[PDB]
Amino acid sequence: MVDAFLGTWKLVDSKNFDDYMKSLGVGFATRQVASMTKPTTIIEKNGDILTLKTHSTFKNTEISFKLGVEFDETTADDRKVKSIVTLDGGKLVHLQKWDGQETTLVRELIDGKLILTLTHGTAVCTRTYEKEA
């Protein structure tokens, strides 16, 4: 039931992303640039393989995965993690594990907007994306 997440999405609001990045140990210069970057996220499916692209003027990433199947990932901040993405309560939940640490990247649809909640430690960041035509 991932279909409503598919498409091209643009960042239109960000709350507490610096706190999230700081919690992950991201350096101040990268945080500075990141705080002024507006990514485009593209979510595509081919059968039961999802591909999630994050494009920006600063960093770009791409992951492909099957729901519910662990995959290796190297994040935009260069963490090497073990990841799984699932649907839970209609939300796309991406869990990353490394060094006994965890972070979740939770996507939900609210009134047509895609709300991405990033949690690590006590830091909770909420980013809002709107759908591009």
Ligand SMILES: O=C(O)CC1CCCCCCCCCCCCCCC1
């Ligand atoms: O998808 C999001 O909106 C958040 C992730 C991507 C951010 C891409 C733009 C800025 C690059 C920042 C690099 C250091 C922090 C990366 C944290 C994980 C990816 C967040």
